[PDB]
Design a protein around this nucleic acid. Structure first.
Lengths: 80, 91, 134, 94, 107, 94, 107, 80, 91
DNA sequence: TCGGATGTATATATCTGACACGTGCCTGGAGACTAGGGAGTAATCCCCTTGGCGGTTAAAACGCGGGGGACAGCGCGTACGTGCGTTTAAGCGGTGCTAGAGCTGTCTACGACCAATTGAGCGGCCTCGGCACCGGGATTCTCGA
DNA sequence: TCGAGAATCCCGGTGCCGAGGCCGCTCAATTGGTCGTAGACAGCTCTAGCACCGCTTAAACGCACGTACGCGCTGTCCCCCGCGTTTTAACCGCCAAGGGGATTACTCCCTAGTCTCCAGGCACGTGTCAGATATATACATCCGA
């Protein structure tokens, strides 16, 4: 009944099989949730700042890309 | 046995891996802990931006990490392999 | 919390019109009378929120008066018993308002139903029509 | 009434010009729309500095010719430094 | 009173001069904008788009498809060296990764 | 003759104000001179974008606030915005 | 015909308003510059310089010196966490590094 | 009689002792010269471009800092 | 024995390590291979900018590399430890 | 270690949802011209780099011989991958609703510009003194029993 | 363990040069006053997004699993460290010359700017087909038997 436990063990394994990982230890499932939670807190912090600057109550796709722009990971495909 | 089939299958396709509805509940809960917790609406296009950017971060993260597993004479990955790879990246 | 109280307070003052800002804010008496001491609407909330540090569920009662000055967007212990915001009554024209329905979420649209004689909609009608003796 | 614009027509003209029967998905236009704006921003943003660095006030052809000289790996730059130079003389002809 | 001849047509290019020349002033990059600048710039933009689509079509052609999917862009950039040196920081939505099994995992 | 400017006299006030006795070398002023420009770059360079992002063409005091909210990390930012907000009220005090 | 009262003095700050307000127009950041902007900005600049010098003096004080050397700045930034999150990309000339012996190299 | 052999073995060791390196293998002295030579070719390439833009025949300190600015390694201490 | 004295001595001071006159001949030779080889004058202040930026790059490089030595169960560093650390950094 | 079952592959089929292309239009690029100001060009002043010697002195290369590390190899033991019967929650549609996104229309507060009008601020100029460096020398140090 | 062991650090020297401070001064900052306009502000409105419920069925959870796999293991041994002595060149100073960076007065050509037309683009519109998933019939590859 926790949202961070909404990232199942095989779903984490689905990521690592794409990364070319043969065999995964059992303590990864705690660390990967920790790494993912920090990575969102460095974006949702930044994405909501644009959302509250232009005085709205709704995040747009451009809000995320702007947050990822200064973050240093530019994401194409959505744009203006 | 099968895992090598599993690697070539997932590196073939390009669809998302984390399921959307648990991923949506995660991002909305983090947004509550900012802006003094009112709420925020999300464009359904905009939540797909995270779910792309989260997986593309992590898949790129493990490839940097799994090199350290093979460099250590190991095959099985470890959390030591994760935090060190995060440390050398500098963010 | 007091931040989240201020966030409900900051959004409430911004939502009201500045042609009637001093009228309805005087009706709440959330601050004191002579403490209202005019130029810029965004700056006026920047001082009144810092002026809300004096008097500090503490400030949602101003919004129930805000539904009276904007009524186009839609014993008496027979509502507070349903505690499984909370109910925020106000006297009136012999009736009351509710501003009640929410876990804690008081910045969402709570229901409003007077008595002049979401999923929470399924049970908020049950606790009302208690049919007491009055 | 929401009269927006993009580079949607121009990418499809270039693709048709150098490939006869090759189509493109509407998701892939969102790549190329986000692609060319990010290149445009980094080039014009960098060449904005060289005017301010060398104290002049006028972005001309010469700043971009040294901006593309910096913003690309050099082997790809060897054609790009000559491609616009092939083109900029052609405009001043007519 | 002559006919409106496009500067992009006069340059013999494909990308719009007049849109770039409008954007380059309003983007607040400098005070004065030379005439030769946004006609030199569009060719640089044209050479890049003609570069990566020419690799993208070969990804489409080899995978038996006449319609470029976004993954074919991802396979085009990472198979190139020099574009990967340009776009190694930038990710691509619906891109996936290279088919990269690391070397010593084999019988 | 030429004339060149810095921030050095202003910083030497600040150092004297936080410590009435601590001095500073010549090279460390060149550290601080390159420091405060690079902070002045990244704040205004970010704050210029938000004017471009939300289509209003006027950098006001509000856009600096959200840019400092973006650039500085979450703990150090909380004082500087308060140090910022204290400044403008005293400026509008007279 | 009054006396020239400095806006920096009127703000009660230390960093020059009038120099920043001149630079913020000529740096070509936007078209229009608000009055409240380069008086909000100087306080942000003042709070940062007052932050790192206050750590720099303690590096000077502990190393028995009344004159701040540039290494004391390097020891101040890397011993702070949050400034290191700001300045982890930026190096410092005549800085050196932390006295960082890695852990397991000991008898 | 080669300039890249002007970086002696103890000078390379002086760098690694500052980096907290106990013991160094012998094949490092070829690799470190290779790493250093590439790092200068990503800067001197960029630094001379500013030097040839403003039509001069002399590199300044601001030319190097501008090259290191876009490189992503900002160097304080010299400035304007 | 002495090497630990050597580490604390060099991490104490902050002066340069590579000697200037061989470092000057290196940078001038690289500048010949650009601008079609005429020559370029160098401000003596400006060559110190490289000699700061070169050492600050390499000293930061080995600290990232020497972590990989200890992660591999080793103490002696290797060129494998170098190129992998350069690879994960991404430049 | 061959049979061989398990994996691979064009072929086909339909079905479809995207998309290429026609169309009306309308806001924006273009034409043509106007002034004025950037900036290119040209000529000059000395600042600073360059390229000499001497010669000095720490630096560095040669070479060893020591042992400390790397490493190949091997013991167990253990944690993770695979199947698999059992929950279960994601998804999809699906419907009902609306709160906010956004757009348009007045009012005005607020910045730009311009012209005077001082003083804060910048280069010289000098003088003090903090850091720097030598060695006494008072501590505080390391393996023969 | 001990002990003398150099080793560590501290301290009171000369001393230099350099920041700290004071001095003419100018030009950029501020003051005073004028304008339009961006943008603030409030007001409609219809699009997109949250909620909910049902039915799903594919997905996950646990688990028993044996079987790979980390790893501590010890022995081996090539390969750095330290030391020492003998070349080698970096370095400081010094000097001399000079290309070459900065500055200055110069004129005009490029570019903003205006305003006056027009059409290339945009949004919108139906045809339809690539392709994709669908199901096969058909062709190859080695997994445990």
């Amino acid at each position: 009944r926790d949202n961070i436990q909404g990232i199942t063990k095989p779903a984490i394994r689905r990521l690592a099989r794409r990364g070319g990982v043969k065999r995964i230890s059992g303590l990864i499932y705690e660390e990967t949730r920790g790494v993912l939670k920090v990575f969102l807190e460095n974006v949702i912090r930044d994405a909501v700042t644009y959302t509250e600057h232009a005085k709205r109550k709704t995040v747009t796709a451009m809000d995320v890309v702007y947050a990822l722009k200064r973050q240093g990971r530019t994401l194409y495909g959505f744009g203006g | 046995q099968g895992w090598l089939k599993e690697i070539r299958k997932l590196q073939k396709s390009t669809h998302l891996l984390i399921r959307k509805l648990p991923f949506s509940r995660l991002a909305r809960e983090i947004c509550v802990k900012f802006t003094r917790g009112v709420d925020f609406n999300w464009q359904a296009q905009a939540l797909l931006a995270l779910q792309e950017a989260a997986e593309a971060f992590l898949v790129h993260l493990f490839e940097d990490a799994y090199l350290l597993t093979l460099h250590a004479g190991r095959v099985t990955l470890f959390p030591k392999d994760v935090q060190l790879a995060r440390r050398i990246r500098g963010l | 919390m007091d931040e989240t109280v201020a966030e409900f307070i900051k959004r409430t003052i911004l939502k009201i019109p500045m042609n009637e800002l001093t009228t309805i804010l005087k009706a709440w008496d959330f601050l004191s009378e002579n403490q209202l001491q005019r130029q810029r609407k965004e700056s006026v909330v920047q001082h009144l929120i810092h002026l809300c540090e004096e008097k500090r569920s503490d400030a949602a009662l101003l919004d129930i008066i805000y539904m009276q000055f904007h009524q186009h967007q839609k014993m008496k212990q027979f509502k507070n018993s349903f505690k499984k915001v909370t109910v925020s009554f106000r006297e009136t024209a012999v009736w009351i308002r509710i501003a009640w329905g929410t876990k804690p979420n008081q910045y969402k649209p709570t229901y409003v139903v007077y008595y002049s004689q979401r999923r929470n909609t399924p049970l908020l009608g049950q606790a009302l029509t208690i049919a007491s003796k009055h | 009434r929401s009269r927006k614009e993009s580079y949607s027509i121009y990418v499809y003209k270039v693709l048709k010009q150098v490939h006869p029967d090759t189509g493109i998905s509407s998701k892939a236009m969102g790549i190329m729309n986000s692609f060319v704006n990010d290149i445009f921003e980094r080039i014009a943003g960098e060449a904005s500095r060289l005017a301010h660095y060398n104290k002049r006030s006028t972005i001309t052809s010469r700043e971009i010719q040294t901006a593309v000289r910096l913003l690309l790996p050099g082997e790809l730059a060897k054609h790009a430094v000559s491609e616009g130079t092939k083109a900029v003389t052609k405009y001043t002809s007519a | 009173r002559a006919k409106a001849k496009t500067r992009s047509s006069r340059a013999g290019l494909q990308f719009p001069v007049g849109r770039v020349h409008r954007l380059l002033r309003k983007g607040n990059y400098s005070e004065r904008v030379g005439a030769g600048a946004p006609v030199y710039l569009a060719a640089v933009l044209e050479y890049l788009t003609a570069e990566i689509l020419e690799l993208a079509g070969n990804a489409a052609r080899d995978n038996k498809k006449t319609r470029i999917i976004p993954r074919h862009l991802q396979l085009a950039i990472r198979n190139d060296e020099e574009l990967n040196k340009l776009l190694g920081r930038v990710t691509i939505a619906q891109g996936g990764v290279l088919p990269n099994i690391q070397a010593v995992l084999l019988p």
